[PDB]
Amino acid sequence: EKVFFVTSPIYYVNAAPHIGHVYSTLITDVIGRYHRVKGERVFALTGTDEHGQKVAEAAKQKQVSPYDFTTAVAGEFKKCFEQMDYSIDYFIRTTNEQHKAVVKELWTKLEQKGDIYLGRYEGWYSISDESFLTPQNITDGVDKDGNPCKVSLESGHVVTWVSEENYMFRLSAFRERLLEWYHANPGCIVPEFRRREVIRAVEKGLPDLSVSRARATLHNWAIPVPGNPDHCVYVWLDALTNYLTGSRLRVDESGKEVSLVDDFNELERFPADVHVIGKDILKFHAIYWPAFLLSAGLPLPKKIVAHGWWTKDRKKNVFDPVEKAEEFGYDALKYFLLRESGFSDDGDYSDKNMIARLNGELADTLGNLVMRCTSAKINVNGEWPSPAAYTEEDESLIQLIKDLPGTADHYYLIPDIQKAIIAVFDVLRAINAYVTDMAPWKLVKTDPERLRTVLYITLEGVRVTTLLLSPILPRKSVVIFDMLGVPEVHRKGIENFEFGAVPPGTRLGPAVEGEVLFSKRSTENT
Numbered sequence: 069e070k071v072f073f074v075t076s077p078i079y080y081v082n083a084a085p086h087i088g089h090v091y092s093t094l095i096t097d098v099i100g101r102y103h104r105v106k107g108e109r110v111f112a113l114t115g116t117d118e119h120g121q122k123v124a125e126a127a128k129q130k131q132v133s134p135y136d137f138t139t140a141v142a143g144e145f146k147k148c149f150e151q152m153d154y155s156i157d158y159f160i161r162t163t164n165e166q167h168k169a170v171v172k173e174l175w176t177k178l179e180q181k182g183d184i185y186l187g188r189y190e191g192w193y194s195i196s197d198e199s200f201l202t203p204q205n206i207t208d209g210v211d212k213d214g215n216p217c218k219v220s221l222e223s224g225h226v227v228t229w230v231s232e233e234n235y236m237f238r239l240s241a242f243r244e245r246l247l248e249w250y251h252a253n254p255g256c257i258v259p260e261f262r263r264r265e266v267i268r269a270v271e272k273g274l275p276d277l278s279v280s281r282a283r284a285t286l287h288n289w290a291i292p293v294p295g296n297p298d299h300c301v302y303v304w305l306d307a308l309t310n311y312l313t314g315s316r317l318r319v320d321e322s323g324k325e326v327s328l329v330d331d332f333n334e335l336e337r338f339p340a341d342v343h344v345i346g347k348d349i350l351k352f353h354a355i356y357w358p359a360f361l362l363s364a365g366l367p368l369p370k371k372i373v374a375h376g377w378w379t380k381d382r383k384k385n386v387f388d389p390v391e392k393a394e395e396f397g398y399d400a401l402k403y404f405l406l407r408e409s410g411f412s413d414d415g416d417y418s419d420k421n422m423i424a425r426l427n428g429e430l431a432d433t434l435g436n437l438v439m440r441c442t443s444a445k446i447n448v449n450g451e452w453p454s455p456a457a458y459t460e461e462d463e464s465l466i467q468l469i470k471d472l473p474g475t476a477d478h479y480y481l482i483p484d485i486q487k488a489i490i491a492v493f494d495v496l497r498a499i500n501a502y503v504t505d506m507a508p509w510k511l512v513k514t515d516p517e518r519l520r521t522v523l524y525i526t527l528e529g530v531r532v533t534t535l536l537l538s539p540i541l542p543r544k545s546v547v548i549f550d551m552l553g554v555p556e557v558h559r560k561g562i563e564n565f566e567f568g569a570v571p572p573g574t575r576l577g578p579a580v581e582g583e584v585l586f587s588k589r590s591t592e593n594t
């Protein structure tokens with residue numbers, strides 16, 4: 069097989085990192101984490117998009133060199149992402165000398181294949197989105213001065229007219245084939261309604277894309293077109309190539325890049341198994357990216373998943389990812405974002421709701437359940453008991469726990485992480501209802517033979533749910549497993565998705581004094 073290759077979009081370094089970037093990368097991170105938990109080879113990629121007019125003109129407005137500015141902001145992105153405790157394998161920068169090489173090579177391939185020609189683009193362009201737009205996608209709006217101007221219907225930013233001699237990619241010639249690709253691979257774009265957006269857009273027709281810009285326009289802050297120093301490679305063709313680059317970089321233990329391989333196969337990563345993106349950058353990944361790859365005779369990605377947030381921009385609920393993490397907890401925060409947000413963001417991100425979920429699901433449902441099946445009160449010998457005979461209620465719960473991995477697996481592979489969490493927690497609420505009925509606290513006295521059966525199922529339930537919640541709560545899953553005393557070997561691998569991987573007689577971990585797994589926040593805000 070292959071290295072499971074998951075990516076996030078590489079973010080413009082025009083401004084400090086914020087929740088949006090963190091969320092996108094968090095999705096990339098989780099998908100990665102779950103595949104490692106299945107014991108697969110993983111390579112999760114993230115990074116910054118440093119070239120372009122947008123970034124150049126942000127660096128100019130802060131009275132600083134593009135090189136110095138992008139290094140600065142890039143550093144802030146890395147710091148942020150380190151604080152968030154992702155398990156990302158590499159942070160790429162499009163200023164990397166080796167990335168530049170891949171871009172020049174891809175361009176040459178495109179030119180050699182006959183799909184790049186010298187023409188003009190005369191039309192609208194949004195600098196903030198670095199996006200060509202047709203007149204149907206612009207409208208009337210207000211310049212930040214206050215004067216009347218034209219803006220993008222998509223994003224809302226100011227659009228400007230551009231008339232330039234540019235190099236043009238023959239995107240038009242790839243309509244028939246992109247349509248074949250969407251139809252033949254109906255999981256390739258997720259969620260389904262966005263997939264239908266891409267097909268209708270492409271069905272309507274595709275014009276040629278301008279893959280270069282005049283040197284001056286971009287303030288010489290971009291990759292030169294091979295064989296034409298007066299032009300620069302479109303920031304987006306540059307940016308997209310990051311995926312091919314990352315697939316070709318050998319990385320040391322520091323996470324520093326040490327070599328660029330000649331051919332993507334050497335590292336067994338390309339094409340991406342999943343590109344995590346946001347809704348604002350769909351066309352670049354679903355239309356251009358493959359059209360480029362089809363031209364160069366490279367393989368197409370397997371899945372693009374486009375979540376409900378804007379990868380860029382400040383909208384809505386002011387969140388500092390790190391200040392909320394320090395406030396409510398890191399794993400708790402990540403859980404909250406992944407649980408509360410589905411594919412259309414009808415999400416309630418208020419403090420009230422965060423507290424309600426942390427208290428509700430993380431403390432009451434998961435938390436209380438862990439503390440019960442490890443309590444000296446209930447689990448008197450601090451060990452995994454041997455179950456006696458199973459009742460029909462016993463087996464009904466066992467069935468749920470046995471089916472959870474199959475279900476959770478599918479949801480992660482769509483991927484729909486929200487559905488995966490709900491799936492797991494459905495099984496947790498069930499376990500709690502079982503314990504409530506069985507009153508194990510009473511059985512300690514009455515029927516110890518029975519309690520063995522009840523404790524074992526509860527323990528195994530907790531174990532398997534926690535295993536499946538480990539890509540969401542990576543730190544707290546370790547705290548859980550320590551409490552249950554699960555050996556390191558049983559914390560990973562599809563072998564341990566099975567009911568009863570941990571044998572009876574396994575001892576629980578040391579009970580720490582005044583220990584709380586998820587501490588309850590104050591429900592009463594006023």
Ligand code: MET
Nearest residue numbers: 077078079080117307308
């Ligand atoms: C190849 S993904 C590029 C995304 C772009 N830099 C953004 O921040 O939206």
